[PDB]
Structures are given as C-alpha cells and as structure tokens.
C-alpha cells in the first residue's frame, strides 16, 4: 500500500485520463523578486516563505498550501542551466515558480555566492522542484499529475524561448530526449539506478 502502488495499478488509467485533459493554465505572478533580491532575503513572496541560511547553498521557497494533503513519495525535479545564466533563468521562471496555480509548493534555487564560498560544483541542478500527491490518502489524482506535467513543460519552453543555455544533468537523474533542462529523480529509491528511474511509473506518466 503506497503512492507508487496506486500508480502501478492505475498506470494506463491515469495516462488516458491525462491525455484527454485540456491545457491547464497558470496565472504567472509579477510582484516577485528578481534573483539578486532572492540572494538577499527572511521574507515572503506571494505565499512562499523564502529562506537563505548559510549551512546551505540554496535559497528555499515553501508555500504552506493547505490542500496538498498527501505525504511525500520522493518525487522531485531538477533544472539544469549553465551556471552563469542562473539569474536569467530564475527571472524567466519567477512568474511560474511563484504562480498561485503552480503545483509545486516547495522548491529551491542555488545561491551563486554561497556556491563560490563553499566551492560547490555548479554544472547542473541549480533549481530543485519538490512534488507530493494531492489526495489526503497520498494518491496522485489524474488532474494533479496532468497539471504537474503541464507545469514542468511550461518551465522547459520558457527557458528555451529565452535562449537559456542548457546545463549538465546530474548523473543520478534521468530525462527524455525532449527535456533540455528538466530531469527527474526519486530520492526514496549506478546507471543501473538510472534505468530504475526510467521505468518509474511517475516518471513515465510525465514523459509518454
């Protein structure tokens, strides 16, 4: 009994219901900080609590959305861009990342200054997007999965429309041919571990 079991058992059902749903739209937000402002935040932007603590290399963003009642199943995404274009990528994505319609309640961005201070290799994953089922019982609803897939793809093209240079996907992640910045990983689960992810029902529902 688990989130992944419900997925395996409704695998085709979720896939068919999802492809039949109309494009979902996200009202992007404008009253948002730009990267430099984020580097220097404790503050709050449209529901998301912003935190930068030093024992980290990230600036965290978390919204206490009282709807996502499910429990974390380890599903998350990364966004990889050339280290130098983090500020350009962040600005481009800010409208969505802070959107009231975004399905992602918790995410983080690499803080370039702390990346230098802590001599951290920044070739990829400057952004991390956390995801968990919407249903109190921890099962992903087809409507939620669809919105999440639409969201991720909205991220993808917003980045390429802005000519953002692709980064290097973390070796512990997987991604389709059509994902130039986005990659997937499930932390609750070598290139053996990568094919494991590739057959993950959640990942396949975001890809095929």
Q: Within a domain: residue 100?
A: yes
Kindly list the distances between the CA atom of residue 34 and the CA atoms of 14, 20, 140, in Å, as whole numbers in the listed order: 37, 36, 32
CB half-sphere exposure, 15, CA atoms < 13 A: 14
Q: Determined by which method? A: X-ray
Quick one: resolution in A? 2.4
Verify whether residue 53 is a known catalytic residue.
no
Q: Within a domain: residue 23?
A: no
Give the strands of the sheet with 182-186, arranged side by side.
43-45, 48-51, 58-63, 106-110, 127-130, 75-79, 182-186
Q: Within a domain: residue 22?
A: no
Q: Where are the beta strands (DSSP E) in the chain?
A: 43-45, 48-51, 58-63, 75-79, 106-110, 127-130, 182-186
Q: Who contacts 183 (Cβ-Cβ below 8 Å, separation ≥6)?
A: 77, 78, 79, 80, 124, 125, 169, 170, 173, 174, 175
Kindly list the distances between the CA atom of residue 3 and the CA atoms of 119, 122, 202, in Å, as whole numbers in the listed order: 37, 32, 10
Q: Within a domain: residue 31?
A: no
Interatomic CA distance for residues 10 and 120, integer angstroms: 41
Active-site option among 108, 132, 146, 147: 108
Q: Within a domain: residue 25?
A: no
Active-site option among 6, 78, 114, 175: 78
Interatomic CA distance for residues 9 and 11, integer angstroms: 6
Q: Within a domain: residue 24?
A: no
Residue 68 belongs to a domain with what CATH number?
Answer: 3.30.2430.10
Number of domain units in the chain:
1
* Tokens linked to 170: 């973390």
Verify whether residue 108 is a known catalytic residue.
yes
Interatomic CA distance for residues 108 and 11, integer angstroms: 30
Q: Within a domain: residue 113?
A: yes
Q: Within a domain: residue 35?
A: no
Domain that holds residue 125: 1-17+41-208
């Amino acid at each position: 009994p688990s989130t992944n079991k419900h997925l395996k058992n409704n695998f085709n059902s979720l896939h068919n219901q999802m492809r039949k749903m109309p494009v979902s739209h996200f009202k992007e937000a404008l009253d948002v900080p730009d990267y430099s402002g984020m580097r220097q935040s404790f503050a709050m932007s449209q529901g998301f609590q912003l935190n930068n603590h030093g024992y980290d290399v990230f600036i965290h963003a978390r919204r206490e959305s009282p709807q996502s009642q499910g429990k974390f199943a380890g599903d998350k995404f990364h966004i990889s861009v050339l280290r130098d274009m983090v500020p350009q990528a962040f600005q481009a994505l800010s409208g969505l990342l802070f959107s009231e319609d975004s399905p992602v309640d918790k995410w983080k961005v690499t803080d370039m200054e702390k990346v230098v201070q802590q001599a951290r290799v920044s070739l990829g994953a400057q952004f991390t997007l956390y995801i968990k089922p919407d249903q109190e019982n921890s099962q992903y609803s087809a409507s939620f999965l669809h919105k999440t897939r639409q969201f991720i793809e909205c991220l993808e093209s917003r980045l390429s429309e802005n000519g953002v240079i692709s980064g290097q996907c973390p070796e512990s992640d997987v991604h389709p041919e059509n994902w130039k910045y986005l990659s997937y990983r499930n932390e609750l689960r070598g290139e053996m571990q990568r094919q494991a992810l590739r057959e993950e029902p959640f990942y396949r529902l975001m890809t095929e």
